[PDB]
RNA sequence: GCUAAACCUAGCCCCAAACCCACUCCACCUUACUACCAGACAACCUUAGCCAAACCAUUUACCCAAAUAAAGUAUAGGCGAUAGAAAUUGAAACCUGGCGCAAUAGAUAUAGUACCGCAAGGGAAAGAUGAAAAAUUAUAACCAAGCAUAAUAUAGCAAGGACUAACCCCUAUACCUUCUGCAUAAUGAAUUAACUAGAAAUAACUUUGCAAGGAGAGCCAAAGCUAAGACCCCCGAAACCAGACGAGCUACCUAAGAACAGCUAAAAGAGCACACCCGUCUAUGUAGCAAAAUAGUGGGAAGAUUUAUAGGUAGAGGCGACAAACCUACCGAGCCUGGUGAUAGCUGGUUGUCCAAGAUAGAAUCUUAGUUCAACUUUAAAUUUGCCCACAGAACCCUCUAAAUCCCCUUGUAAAUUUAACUGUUAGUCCAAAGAGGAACAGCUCUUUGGACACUAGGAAAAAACCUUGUAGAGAGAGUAAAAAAUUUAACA
RNA sequence: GCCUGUUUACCAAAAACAUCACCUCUAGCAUCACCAGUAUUAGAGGCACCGCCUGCAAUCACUUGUUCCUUAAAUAGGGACCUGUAUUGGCUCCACGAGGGUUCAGCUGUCUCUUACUUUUAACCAGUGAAAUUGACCUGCCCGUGAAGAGGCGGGCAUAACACAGCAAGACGAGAAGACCCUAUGGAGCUUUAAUUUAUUAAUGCAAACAGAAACCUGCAUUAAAAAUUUCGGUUGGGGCGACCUCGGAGCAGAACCCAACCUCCGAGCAGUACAUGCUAAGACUUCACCAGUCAAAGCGAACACUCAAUUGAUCCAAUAACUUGACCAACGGAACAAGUUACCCUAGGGAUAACAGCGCAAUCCUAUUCUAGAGUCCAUAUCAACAAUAGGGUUUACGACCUCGAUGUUGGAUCAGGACAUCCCGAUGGUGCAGCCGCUAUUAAAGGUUCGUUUGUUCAACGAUUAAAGUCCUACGUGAUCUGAGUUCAGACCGGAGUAAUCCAGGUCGGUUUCUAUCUACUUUCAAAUUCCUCCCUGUACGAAAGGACAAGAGAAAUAAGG
């Protein structure tokens, strides 16, 4: 068999580029980008924008949830004073929430 | 054309063939969505915006009862009683700017409608047509040159009674009794002082109204109209005015 | 360009058939005036043996058991050993009806744990489990366990705190978690004392040495009950005829790297579900010399002699066998065949 | 200047109108066209199939008695290709015509004749003076191929540049079609003349009329509606069905006949051997004498023989000493007519001029010789960004730690997207590079990036794929691009 | 094969068919066949007369090996022996046959080796006067190149024009879209346990209708019979007895995405936990289309978008009150339901595509050097040679599918050959484990030559006798418009094998149509130099211990070749 094709996933929108809230920002088999300030993630690992604005990457600390035992038995083998890191996307946002407006004069 | 193939040779296939797939409107499951269309009514809409603009061109008299045919007549509708059409239905488009006391028959009228026309003084009543005498209503010029006699239109369905039997909808087989009741709600309700038509000079002929069994007005069921002569002819058997009369 | 115009092309036989002819050539002379005896238990249903779950109401069912008039040779084999004068793997409870009985077990339920009550299994593939004479604290190997016929036995015991079941087939292996989930609860099964993944067994002469006491290895084989009677995935087909020719050879592969596996002073049963000599004796032999050619090492072959006495009475064995136990399907005794041998590493 | 070439009528086609012919004498259902004897003889019975459904098996339009409209609506349907009403509505109507044909046209027609076939059946060709032929002193010139007038002189797709001059010099690999690519030794064409192949208006577009209305009833309408213009080929199967016609050849049978010297033998499916029949071997012949023969040599030659005559069995069949033989010179299913312009995803062809834009991602498919969709390409229209690209930014288990992408403001530039309307191409090649399969072979196979080629020219000898170079004309001007292989080797204490 | 006889009219006359004889099967009877008959008869079949034969498996036949006879030589013909298989079945015998093999003597131009003559044809004079064919030609050779085989392109050479008569190397010559493989959701025949049917026929049952029981008829059923309709999925695979078709991960594809096989590897057609695995709704992804597929804020309602890479099937239709459910439709974008065979084949095409050939390539094959280990008493190098290395060749076996599917079947032989030298013989010359003769090896040499026979279709080979030698190749595996048609190849048949059958076969056996009038190129007396063996002489000389035994020169004789 193995005549699969590919399932067309990878970035969906780059560094700096303008995203509305539930724009798909990068889909993927595993985590290789991790979800950042408003950003979602679904059940197929697929990270998608919570808020309107623009598009970040930045490397980040990894602190994994205790819950997480495989996670957990990671960092407690590591060497004192080692720091994992990893590749995070941030959605910064744009327009504020909303703004004061008079409607009246009573 | 081409090189060769079916393209060059017009042996093409049919429209929606895709090569040997299954075609994409055969793969698409079957719904309701047309069932039974041809059995639907339909309506034609009748804006106050247009109703106002007739009557401002003269083209609708307001001093006389407006009926399909004046709607016809002044080419304000284009009923097609072959393509399912069941009259005109009164709609609430243009309801702030309507001012005329009219006393206009519609098939259907919407509540905000109905509450326009009895807010300047008119009067608005809803009545039943069967095809067959729709088209008689909307061309009469075209019947009278059949040589038949005038037949009484056919109640309404057993599905539309319940409509045309209440006052509310200002049915034309309603208790006249409970139209008092009905017409001070929509003034309570869209706020407005309603007027009594009873004092106004034409409330004789806002009153005209035909019977239910009645096509014209003056012109009884059973009659023949010969416009050559200018003359109508009223059979008198016994049998045949029971028939036209019941 | 290929030639569709042969002269003459060899008749279509089915894989059943194709199975029969094989084995009849070949046991005809092997057996001799036993194998129509044999042929005919080969070509009717197999007895179905219910083993008992211990996990679930084990006392409850045997109760059950008893009302369709179940015997427990394994109750009746335990007391049979002070009666002739390593012992057995302890703890198991296997129900069957009397010789000549033709009753059928009725499907298992599950119980109020929401495991099943038992499991059917042929009451011949129970004996490699008991000849390998369990201990309570040990390490068992299993090759080849999926589906589980001798991998869910062994849980039974309850002498295995780790268990390392591995299968190269993984549709197998999916069927081997199945079955431990439905019948041993999942508390067993949650740490690592039931390792279940899907490798070649040859690797486990290599990555584990001398890790494991017990090794049960059931290479694979070509099933007599199986090859009769299925007719998808047979071993006797055209396309598979490679296999069956190679297949000795990987029975010599698997058993010899599951005796590096095993630790010194350890016992390994080598079990086999087959009735040929050249895949049951000389398969067995070829892994001692092949050890002790290449990496130097010594086994000893225990008897099972004092062990097929006490099953006589509920199973058909064969006497004419150089180092295994040869245990030979019968009308009376329908469980079969196994092949059981037992040789410990020194 | 010969052969020829021209020359307009005969007549026909489509409508309208109107309902048509059929006893001079004689002969004509028997072997028709035959004056003249005993008979019994009776007509009536669903069409099918091709074809479409991309096979096929249910199914698949065929005037059925009023145009229009309702309406391609209700319904029918492997609910799928496709089939398809009714109620109801109501129409004018003046034969004496032609933006029909003019001898390869129009009916086949000068004629259902000549001719062909046993029969059913098929089916032509052509004529041309003048008012006068009772003017032949006639109806003068020029015009296709083919010839003649008038054979030929080194050398070559027959020509071009030229030149004082035909050749000599220089340059130049016929046309169409099918393929990635044809001078190709791949297809077709001897040549001349005539004939011979793109039919449909749903949508959209364009240009008028009118306009919230349009239209000469019905229909459509949230700027529409009416009208016009403008897009959809030709030839070819093997087959299938229906109804007829055929056993004068042949296969077998029936009726009543005929033939078989001589010799040897015996009352012989005997021998030798004529007539006769048959056709073993060889040669000639191979468009022949002959669509099966000639010469010689052979088999049988009183029999299961040969043969004349008349009759019979007819295709879903006959008949057969079974050879799949024979049934009117192509029988694994005769011929003819009709369905029929059967169908063909296959082959071939597809006719005036000029200009412009214009090539290689794929998916599905009883599908890989096709088609549909997308990609690409074209026109029209709308709109605003498009391309190039500065930092920044895009993963770990993984150091072939790769070449390089994606994103991307400036900037250089002028395109891009969306809307409307559809066609067409996708059986590709080779070179460079990375990597697979084969053998670290192939003008080998299979992906990726890029170029070239199917677009011109120059240079590598000739040269689709290498290099140089593109946007188009004239010049008897000029400057340049790529562009010419190197190499000759052994004394010795 | 009993015999006479019969059959493919126009490629097969036979071993095939028929045939007396024998065997099996069916039928108890009238008024168009059988039959104006009646079990000693009629019909449907098999085998092919006659004669002979056991066990209760023998004998035989077939088969595997061995040997003998014939021939100078025997893959042939004849007989015997050994092994295995097979059995109702098998083995002999007359006669006969245009059947197929072997042979005796004889016969003969069949041949060694052709020759002469006549006749027809032929050529010329006179008369009459075709056909296939034809893009245009003002139509050369060599080498190279090219869609891979050039009269037309490149580079050289040759070259006044011109008819007639010959020739058959070329014009991939002409003649029937040739045969041969492949393709088509193109046909047809035939067979059947392919699919779909019993209308039709026949036999029963019931209803009907009757008598009083029955039959005929009609309707509806069930059995068969005999027919009818229709189809023969693709992918891959020269020596097989198949794998494969949908979905997912990893390598190729190293870094956004995408990216193929005959590829390189492993799988999936589930299970488990939930029971709000409820209801709704912005904005996006999307397996390069579509269909499907994926994520999802907020809100309502409750609690306090399940795990898993794949784990899946559209429409119609059926079921259902409804909600919902239904196909290893796995050929997995799925036709509601259809298999083989054809060499009796047909049509439309395909050099996209096979075999032969040409061409590419050099794994294989072949050859020479390099290396110096090792054989050769000693000794690498008189010879021979390992592991390898370096080049060349295009003769085999393969690989590629580029050219030819709108008339070359291939093999072999006959005829005539041109060419290469990597030389079998003749010539010249080094080395030698070369005394001389014989030999071995190497350089040089293509002027000349290189046999006749038996079985075999043979190429080859075996052995028969010879020769100074009986060379390796190429040339469209030369040459078939010069010939042959034996093997293979179309229709017949048989033996053995496969298949239910039709029918098939890399096997054996028998038979089986080989067209052409020369338009063009080329050519049609190379005006004339010959090679070889044997014998003799030198000479019984040199050499050698003898056995043996030569050079060069000269002579004679013979043979072929060339020319008379
Ligand atoms: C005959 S079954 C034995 C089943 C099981 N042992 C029992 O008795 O119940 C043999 C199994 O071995 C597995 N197997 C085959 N090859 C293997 C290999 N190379 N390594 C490990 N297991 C293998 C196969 O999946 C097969 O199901
Ligand atoms: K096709
Ligand atoms: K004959
Ligand atoms: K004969
Ligand atoms: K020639
Ligand atoms: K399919
Ligand atoms: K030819
Ligand atoms: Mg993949
Ligand atoms: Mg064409
Ligand atoms: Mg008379
Ligand atoms: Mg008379
Ligand atoms: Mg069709
Ligand atoms: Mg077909
Ligand atoms: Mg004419
Ligand atoms: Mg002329
Ligand atoms: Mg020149
Ligand atoms: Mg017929
Ligand atoms: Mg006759
Ligand atoms: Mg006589
Ligand atoms: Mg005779
Ligand atoms: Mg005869
Ligand atoms: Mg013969
Ligand atoms: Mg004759
Ligand atoms: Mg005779
Ligand atoms: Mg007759
Ligand atoms: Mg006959
Ligand atoms: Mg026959
Ligand atoms: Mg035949
Ligand atoms: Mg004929
Ligand atoms: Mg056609
Ligand atoms: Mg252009
Ligand atoms: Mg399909
Ligand atoms: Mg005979
Ligand atoms: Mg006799
Ligand atoms: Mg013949
Ligand atoms: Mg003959
Ligand atoms: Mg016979
Ligand atoms: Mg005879
Ligand atoms: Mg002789
Ligand atoms: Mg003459
Ligand atoms: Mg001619
Ligand atoms: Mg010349
Ligand atoms: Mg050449
Ligand atoms: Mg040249
Ligand atoms: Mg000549
Ligand atoms: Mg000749
Ligand atoms: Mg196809
Ligand atoms: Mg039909
Ligand atoms: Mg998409
Ligand atoms: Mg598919
Ligand atoms: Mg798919
Ligand atoms: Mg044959
Ligand atoms: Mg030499
Ligand atoms: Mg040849
Ligand atoms: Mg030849
Ligand atoms: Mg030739
Ligand atoms: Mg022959
Ligand atoms: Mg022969
Ligand atoms: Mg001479």
């Known amino acids: 068999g193995g005549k699969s094709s590919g399932r067309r996933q990878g970035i969906k929108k780059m560094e700096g580029h303008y995203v509305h809230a539930g724009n798909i920002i990068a889909t993927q088999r595993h985590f290789r980008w991790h979800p950042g300030a408003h950003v979602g993630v679904g059940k197929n690992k697929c990270l998608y924008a919570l808020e309107e604005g623009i598009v970040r990457y930045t490397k980040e600390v990894y602190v994994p949830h205790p819950r997480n035992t495989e996670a957990v038995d990671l960092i407690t083998r590591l060497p004192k004073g080692a720091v994992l890191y990893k590749t995070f996307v941030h959605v910064v946002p744009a327009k504020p929430e909303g703004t004061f407006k008079l409607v009246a004069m009573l | ?246 | 360009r290929y030639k569709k115009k042969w002269a003459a092309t060899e008749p279509k036989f089915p894989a059943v058939r194709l199975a029969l002819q094989n084995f009849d050539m070949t046991y005809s002379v092997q057996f001799g005036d036993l194998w129509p005896s044999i042929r005919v238990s080969l070509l009717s249903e197999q007895k179905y043996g219910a083993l008992v779950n211990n996990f679930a109401a084990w006392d409850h069912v045997s109760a059950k058991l008893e009302q369709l008039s179940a015997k427990d040779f394994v109750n009746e084999a335990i007391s049979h050993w002070e009666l002739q004068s390593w012992a057995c793997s302890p703890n198991l409870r296997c129900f069957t009806f009397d010789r000549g009985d033709i009753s059928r077990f009725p499907p298992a339920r599950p119980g109020s744990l929401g495991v099943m009550e038992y499991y059917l299994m042929d009451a011949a593939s129970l004996l490699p489990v008991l000849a390998l004479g369990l201990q309570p604290g040990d390490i068992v190997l299993d090759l080849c366990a999926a589906p589980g016929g001798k991998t869910l036995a062994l849980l039974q015991t309850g002498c295995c705190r780790n268990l390392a079941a591995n299968d190269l087939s993984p549709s197998r292996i999916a069927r081997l978690q199945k079955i431990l989930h439905s019948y041993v609860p999942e508390e067993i099964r949650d740490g690592n004392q039931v390792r279940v993944t899907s490798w070649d067994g040859r690797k486990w002469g290599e990555l584990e040495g001398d890790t494991y006491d017990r090794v049960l290895v059931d290479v694979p084989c070509t099933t007599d009950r199986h090859s009769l009677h299925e007719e998808e995935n047979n071993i006797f087909k055209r396309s598979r005829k490679k296999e069956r020719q190679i297949l000795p050879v990987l029975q010599v592969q698997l058993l010899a790297a599951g005796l590096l596996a095993t630790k010194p002073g350890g016992h390994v049963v080598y079990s086999t579900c087959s009735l040929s000599h050249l895949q049951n004796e000389y398969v067995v032999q070829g892994a001692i010399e092949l050890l002790a050619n290449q990496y130097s090492i010594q086994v000893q072959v225990e008897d099972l002699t004092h062990f097929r006495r006490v099953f006589m009475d509920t199973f058909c064995f064969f006497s004419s066998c150089q180092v295994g136990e040869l245990v030979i399907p019968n009308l009376m005794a329908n469980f079969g065949p196994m092949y059981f041998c037992k040789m410990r590493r020194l």
């Open chain 2, 1 to 246: 054309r081409g090189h060769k193939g079916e393209r060059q040779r017009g042996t093409r296939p049919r429209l929606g063939f895709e090569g040997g797939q299954t075609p994409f409107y055969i793969r698409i499951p079957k719904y309701g969505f047309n069932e039974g269309h041809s059995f639907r009514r339909q309506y034609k809409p009748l804006s106050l915006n247009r109703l106002q603009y007739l009557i401002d061109l003269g083209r609708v008299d307001p001093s006389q009862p407006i009926d399909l045919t004046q709607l016809v007549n002044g080419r304000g509708v284009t009923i097609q009683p072959l393509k399912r059409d069941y009259g005109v239905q009164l709609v609430e488009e243009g309801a702030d700017t309507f001012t005329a006391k009219v006393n206009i028959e519609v098939q259907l009228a919407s509540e905000l409608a109905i509450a326009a026309i009895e807010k300047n003084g008119g009067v608005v009543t809803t009545a039943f047509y069967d095809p067959r005498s729709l088209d008689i209503v909307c061309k009469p010029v075209p019947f009278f040159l059949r040589g038949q006699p005038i037949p009484k239109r056919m109640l309404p369905p057993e599905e539309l009674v319940p409509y045309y039997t209440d006052a509310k909808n200002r049915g034309y087989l309603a208790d006249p009794a409970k139209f008092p009741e009905a017409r001070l709600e929509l003034a309570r309700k869209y706020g407005y002082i309603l007027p009594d038509i009873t004092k106004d000079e034409l409330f004789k002929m806002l009153c005209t109204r035909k019977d239910p069994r009645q096509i014209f007005f003056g012109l009884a069921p059973g009659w023949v109209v010969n416009m050559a002569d200018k003359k109508i002819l009223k059979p008198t058997d016994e049998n045949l005015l029971k028939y036209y009369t019941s």
